[PDB]
């Protein structure tokens, strides 16, 4: 099916394979999800293309581990993923993303800025 | 509508989003769609959406793209041809089709 | 997909590798393919590959090519027409089709 | 032949009187027609005249328009894509289709 942003609460075998390709550095379980610690992913034609972790603390939220598969970059997958995470968490008034593990900070800033985030020391904010 | 391994697109000079024609050797159907990219190395040829009424998994198809150009250029034009066998193994690329003899 | 005696290609102004339409008078099927060359003098019209689902040996077909041009040129344009009988014997070439009268 | 809510034409960059292709997901038919405008906000997709042999009310279709451009421009071209659900509610517009992965 068309690109769709999903919240992952349970993982199929396929979700496990695709998440290995997105985040080869994580080996889950180790991916504990619950109401405040969420994984959102972008699904296209029955495969996960991208994912991000979200940590909710009421009106504050944090994003980490944002990655789009390199094969499908610059086709709007990351932008739609982040758009939909924000829209589905309307209670959050302040969002923060740390610059941790980011491979290319200058591409990340261009992206985050396109999404209305301001570059700050150590990450990007939208508050 | 048809996702195609990027290596196969490059071999034949087909672009993402380019109109293509598909001729199904297995069931004789002929349809026109557009190319989307599949992951390089995947060997995928995926017939998606409404086009999936026209092919099944395992069907042998011929995928073509057409361009326009002035008459003078068309007289010397050479197409980009790529030839497959087995499970989408690319065996040869070429720039001409031979002449059929009696 | 359709190999055609080179002498027939020249008569009608069709190029190797040019898109062509085939209209089958025998069985009514209409399909689009591209021309490949057959040996000059062979009289061959070979319908190959997936296209062979659409014609059989002995079928009588009409093969056409289409070009684009500006409106002003198209008003004076004359097509290249070649007429066959029997076993692909070329009987006439012409540059216009007459007007059909009541 | 196909009247389309003006808001949907604008979203996909389709013009009144532009040739369009319709691919019917429901019944597998593929046909080409031209766009006419329907009233903005009406959500209408009306298949009219001879085209109504090819779709019924309630059928899910994919409507596409194709343009031509030089090779160099086509390499960076981005299509205008709009995505629907339910009773023709527009859910998203985009400028690229993702890559299909294994």
């Amino acid at each position: 099916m068309k690109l769709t942003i999903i919240r992952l609460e349970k993982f199929s075998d396929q979700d496990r394979i695709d998440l290995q390709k997105i985040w080869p550095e994580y080996s889950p379980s180790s991916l504990q999800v619950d109401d405040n610690h969420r994984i959102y992913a972008a699904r296209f034609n029955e495969r996960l293309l991208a994912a991000v972790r979200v940590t909710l603390s009421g009106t504050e939220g944090a994003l980490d581990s944002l990655r789009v598969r390199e094969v499908t970059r610059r086709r709007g997958v990351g932008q739609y993923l982040l758009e939909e995470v924000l829209r589905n968490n309307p209670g959050v008034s302040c969002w923060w993303m740390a610059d941790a593990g980011v491979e290319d900070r200058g591409v990340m800033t261009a992206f985050m800025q396109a999404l209305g985030f301001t570059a700050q020391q150590g990450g990007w904010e939208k508050c | 509508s048809c996702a195609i391994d990027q290596d196969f697109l490059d071999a034949a000079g087909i672009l993402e989003n380019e109109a293509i024609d598909i001729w199904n050797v297995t069931n004789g159907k002929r349809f026109s769609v557009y190319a989307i990219a599949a992951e390089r190395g995947s060997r995928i040829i995926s017939v998606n959406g409404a086009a999936a009424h026209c092919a099944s998994v395992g069907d042998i198809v011929i995928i073509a793209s057409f361009v326009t150009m002035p008459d003078e250029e068309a007289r010397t034009w050479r197409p980009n041809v790529a030839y497959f066998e087995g499970d989408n193994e690319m065996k040869r690329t070429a720039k001409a089709i031979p002449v059929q003899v009696a | 997909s359709c190999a055609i005696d080179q002498d027939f290609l020249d008569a009608a102004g069709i190029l190797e590798n040019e898109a062509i339409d085939i209209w089958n008078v025998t069985n009514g099927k209409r399909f689009s393919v591209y021309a490949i060359a057959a040996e000059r003098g062979s009289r061959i019209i070979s319908v190959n590959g997936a296209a062979a689902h659409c014609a059989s040996v002995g079928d009588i077909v009409i093969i056409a090519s289409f070009v684009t041009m500006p409106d002003e040129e198209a008003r004076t344009w004359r097509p290249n027409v070649a007429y066959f009988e029997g076993d692909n014997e070329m009987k006439r070439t012409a540059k216009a089709i007459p007007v059909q009268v009541a | 032949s196909c009247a389309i809510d003006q808001d949907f034409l604008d979203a996909a960059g389709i013009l009144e009187n532009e040739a369009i292709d319709i691919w019917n997901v429901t019944n597998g038919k593929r046909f080409s027609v031209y766009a006419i405008a329907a009233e903005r906000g009406s959500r209408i997709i009306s298949v009219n005249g001879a085209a109504a042999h090819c779709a019924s009310v309630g059928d899910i279709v994919i409507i596409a328009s194709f343009v031509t451009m030089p090779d160099e421009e086509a390499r960076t071209w981005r299509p205008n894509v709009a995505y629907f659900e339910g009773d023709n509610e527009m859910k998203r517009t985009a400028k690229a289709i993702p890559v299909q992965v294994a």
Binding site: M1, K2, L3, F44, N45, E46 | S1, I4, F8, A12, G13, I14, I44, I45, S46, V47, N48, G49, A50, A52, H53, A55, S56, V57, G58, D59, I60, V61, I62, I63, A64, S65, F66, V67, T68, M69, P70, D71, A74, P79, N80, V81, A82, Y83, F84, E85, D87, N88 | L15, N17, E18, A19, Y34, V67, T68, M69, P70, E73 | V25, I97
Partner: peptide, 25 residues
């Protein structure tokens, strides 16, 4: 100023790996 339509390229005898009405498309 006559413009011709020419075969650009072709994939000869590839095999369909997947066919799904619900894939995009």
């Amino acid at each position: 100023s006559m413009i011709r339509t020419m075969l650009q390229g072709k994939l000869h005898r590839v095999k369909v790996t997947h066919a799904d009405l619900h894939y995009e498309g």
